[PDB]
Symmetry: C4
Subunit: 170 residues, 4 copies
Amino acid sequence: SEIELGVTEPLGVYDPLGWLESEPEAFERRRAVERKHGRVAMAAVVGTIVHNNHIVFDGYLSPSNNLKFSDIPTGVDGIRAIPTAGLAQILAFFALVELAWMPASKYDGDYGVGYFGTDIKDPEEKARKLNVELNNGRAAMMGIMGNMVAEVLTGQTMYEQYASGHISPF
Amino acid sequence: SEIELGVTEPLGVYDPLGWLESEPEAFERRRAVERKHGRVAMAAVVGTIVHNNHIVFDGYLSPSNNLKFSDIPTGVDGIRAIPTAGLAQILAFFALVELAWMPASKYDGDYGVGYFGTDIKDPEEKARKLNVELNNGRAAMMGIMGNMVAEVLTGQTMYEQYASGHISPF
Amino acid sequence: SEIELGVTEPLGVYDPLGWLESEPEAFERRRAVERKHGRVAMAAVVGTIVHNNHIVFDGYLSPSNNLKFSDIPTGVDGIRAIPTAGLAQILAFFALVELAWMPASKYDGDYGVGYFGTDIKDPEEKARKLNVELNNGRAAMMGIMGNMVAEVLTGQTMYEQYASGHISPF
Amino acid sequence: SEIELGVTEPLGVYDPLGWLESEPEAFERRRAVERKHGRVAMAAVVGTIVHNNHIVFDGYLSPSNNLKFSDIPTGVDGIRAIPTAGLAQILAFFALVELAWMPASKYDGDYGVGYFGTDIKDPEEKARKLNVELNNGRAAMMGIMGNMVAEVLTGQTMYEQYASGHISPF
Ligand code: KC2
Ligand code: KC2
Ligand code: KC2
Ligand code: KC2
């Protein structure tokens, strides 16, 4: 029932380059990659929205570096501002996650957590929720790409872009 | 089972002008219209209650127009105070909704979201919840009409009417 | 299955005066009365706890009477401090409730709202929850009686009794 | 199905001492003890985390002793700081719990409250949740032991240890 997921109006089965029938055996991992990217991009978009609203922690991210949370830029440079030891800690934690707790090798993406802890018994409701996850992931992928591109070209974070009234490109 | 919905005590099947039997084929769309109006009026009544409590966003609705959120009147003139571009954006978003996401042409009103996400498996509980939705929509329709009429006849918003002790018409 | 409800450890079927077998036909209304009193007393105990923590509304209960919410005593005189028109409004609203929406004549006490909106499908879980409701109602009945009696005897509300260290009767 | 609980990756059935087959009849109470310790240690770890974030009640724990809540140390001396009468009250309340409401003699640890009030109908989901409870209890046991040992050896509470940058032992 996985090959039926992600087929939603108005496009239906949208395979413009025709890879569903050309490479039928690769669809499992391609959908795994699509779902992984969708989840990551949804988290990233929520993160950007939180950042540019200046919802930051109170205190120091790295007291040894004298680096407060509010000192971290809200744009694409935020991850670069983090100290190298902090990036190492993030990488170690997500190595543990991605290799043990929710392995990326599990292509169905089903790690037992369900939707808010509970399995969706109704097949129609479960299919609709899975389609919602896929479509929101696709929208978030396009959105995070657009956010990063706009920040890189305009030169301003989303907060700075909105606060200066620079919404119109022309 | 749709024709049994909305039949509740103390009125039961209340058709004073006798259109259930006179026009049996029009009931589907008439109930669709009733449910749509009920949902819209419930949202409108909650909106009026929020407005007259002065629960407003902090900032500017339209910085180019120098129009803060608190500058928008809490009465029937609130929607008129919004800039034309903002009204255009609201209209475009709801055109997308009403034509694609939750089409108004779907007369059963079932867009797959269920009641707080989950389908109601028990037929009795589902019928009770649907009757609750219909009755609350009817009450909200009457309430929003009464609120608008009282504001237009007294010249005061609900907050101004209550704060001045003008809740007695005589 | 109603006659099995309220039978819980350590007392089991506790009928010290032997009215379950003496008047088997009166048990339905007696359990209705017990459940009604339990619900009312649970609400009353929560109300007293809220009052004596000075969690009060901000504003005037009756601006014509120049009576603020904080002016209402938190003890047994609180309901007496309310203006007569306010008591009339409360009585009218609860007449509507108790006669139409959740009639007191419905001895099973099942008004369709369920436990947090949902019916409890598991008979064991449902029986346990009903026993919990009954036992908490009994405890709240005893508690509200004790609170009122202690306030009347000591001359102080619960807040005044606790704040003065007058908890020990001797 | 209890003997299958707690068997999780990567260790599977981890019995280095070989007591599962040496003493098959003692496993019921040993798992009861393990689950009890897991729950107690999870509560203790949450408590330590709350303490060292200085999330304390506002007021006096014991006005007669002139002992505010903020005066109670956040480390291992917190339970020693509270007055003897308060310790007696805590002990009495938990005697009532552990002997009547959720008896420790019930080795299955099933007191009818379920997981957030509801029984888990799906056997796979229920087994996963029980394994989660056991593994989190084991992790919390190790964590609370480590927290207490680190505090007793460094001489500082967790807040004092973190605030001084004394996290690195060398
Ligand atoms: C991925 C999630 C994550 C987890 C689960 C996690 C857990 C723990 C634990 C418990 C096991 C401890 C004890 C601990 C301790 C410290 N952390 Mg964490 N930490 C995470 C992320 C980051 C990031 C992003 C940064 C960071 C930092 C520090 C500093 C530096 C203070 C200073 O330098 O004095 C110290 C002492 C910053 C950094 O090291 O900067 C040099 C920084 O940027 N940490 N950290
Ligand atoms: C229906 C819901 C809705 C959505 C989903 C939505 C999304 C976005 C997005 C993201 C796609 C952007 C980037 C964006 C941007 C701006 N909006 Mg929205 N907007 C919505 C509603 C309104 C309303 C009601 C108003 C309004 C306004 C502005 C202004 C004006 C600022 C200024 O003039 O400098 C700017 C820049 C106000 C207005 O245009 O007044 C002339 C105003 O009244 N918007 N808006
Ligand atoms: C039972 C729940 C309940 C409901 C559902 C409810 C609904 C409404 C509605 C909407 C239909 C209106 C329009 C309305 C209006 C007023 N109420 Mg309510 N009211 C309830 C309870 C009380 C209580 C307890 C009191 C009270 C009061 C007033 C005053 C007095 C202001 C003043 O005197 O200027 C006015 C104008 C106080 C009182 O009348 O004191 C003389 C007072 O004590 N109300 N009330
Ligand atoms: C285990 C949970 C628990 C419960 C369910 C519970 C219920 C009640 C009830 C309702 C039945 C009353 C009426 C009551 C009253 C007092 N309690 Mg509780 N109390 C609990 C725990 C503690 C702790 C830990 C302490 C404490 C205290 C006091 C004091 C002291 C004030 C003073 O000295 O002036 C008074 C009057 C402190 C203490 O006695 O210190 C000498 C203190 O440390 N209590 N307590």
